[PDB]
């Protein structure tokens with residue numbers, strides 16, 4: 001909407017206070033004009049018709065319980081925009097500052113979040129498996145990263161290409177979590193998963209097998225559930241990425257870590273220059289090796305560590 005840029009204040013899902021960029025025109029709207037062509041947050045009102053209505057508020061204060069998922073979807077979309085722009089020189093998900101749209105309060109008891117081809121969508125959870133999913137910065141960045149992938153490599157959402165697609169979203173979700181630097185870790189979704197269980201998470205990149213996901217190509221899922229295991233076999237790539245950054249010895253193979261900034265550079269270049277819609281795990285290894293070669297040189301430690309990490313997870 002046309003209006004003037006304003007700054008509201010509210011509380012997110014976890015009870016933390018933050019300022020949010022809003023727009024005033026009769027109401028105060030969750031419309032942040034400070035980033036690209038805007039970040040827009042909508043109320044889906046417990047329905048499944050999208051996007052719903054642009055979030056309107058009478059007083060620019062967002063402290064009601066019903067407001068909390070909207071505050072966080074809006075704010076964390078801004079952090080994710082900033083990460084891509086400041087770290088990778090990428091302007092929104094399409095590289096040309098496309099408007100970023102999110103809807104919260106999707107459906108009832110909805111234990112998921114997704115990119116629908118055009119926007120982000122967040123359930124509230126059922127209060128047992130999840131609380132409102134926009135409360136996790138890694139979750140928000142995971143979802144926006146699906147849009148980045150779809151506009152770039154275009155990885156088809158099944159089998160190995162789909163598991164790469166998933167891992168890319170977990171990797172960049174985690175790197176955005178580190179960028180914001182509030183309780184960062186290599187776990188996925190811990191802030192919104194299972195409020196009655198402390199210390200768990202939906203997935204682990206440091207130890208995927210803690211939640212049943214494979215950490216070696218020889219343990220890959222070969223069935224048909226979950227689009228051929230896209231949220232399962234992502235563990236193999238998540239583990240490789242963790243090893244590139246942090247190092248370790250895994251199935252007897254030692255990896256010298258190069259840190260999370262270089263991980264991000266290597267995987268961003270692979271995603272945007274070398275991967276294709278049908279890339280498999282072996283082709284991702286080759287793309288990561290080539291990316292590290294471009295950035296650091298063929299004889300570099302960075303290239304050597306990429307090779308060791310993929311060796312450690314059984315991907316040649």
Ligand SMILES: CC(C)C[C@H](NP(=O)(O)CNC(=O)OCc1ccccc1)C(=O)NC[C@@H](C)C(C)(C)C
Nearest residue numbers: 111112113114115116117139142143146189202231
């Ligand atoms: C980061 C996480 C909290 C949320 C993330 N959502 P996602 O990976 O983003 C779901 N995304 C999804 O299924 O996309 C398919 C699609 C939908 C609409 C249009 C086109 C394609 C995700 O991992 N979900 C699976 C969990 C909930 C399991 C337990 C595997 C069912």
Ligand SMILES: [Ca+2]
Nearest residue numbers: 057059061062
């Ligand atoms: Ca209000």
Ligand SMILES: [Ca+2]
Nearest residue numbers: 183184185190
């Ligand atoms: Ca965390």
Ligand SMILES: [Ca+2]
Nearest residue numbers: 138187188189
């Ligand atoms: Ca996390």
Ligand SMILES: [Ca+2]
Nearest residue numbers: 193194195197
């Ligand atoms: Ca939990």
Ligand SMILES: [Zn+2]
Nearest residue numbers: 142146166169
């Ligand atoms: Zn995903």
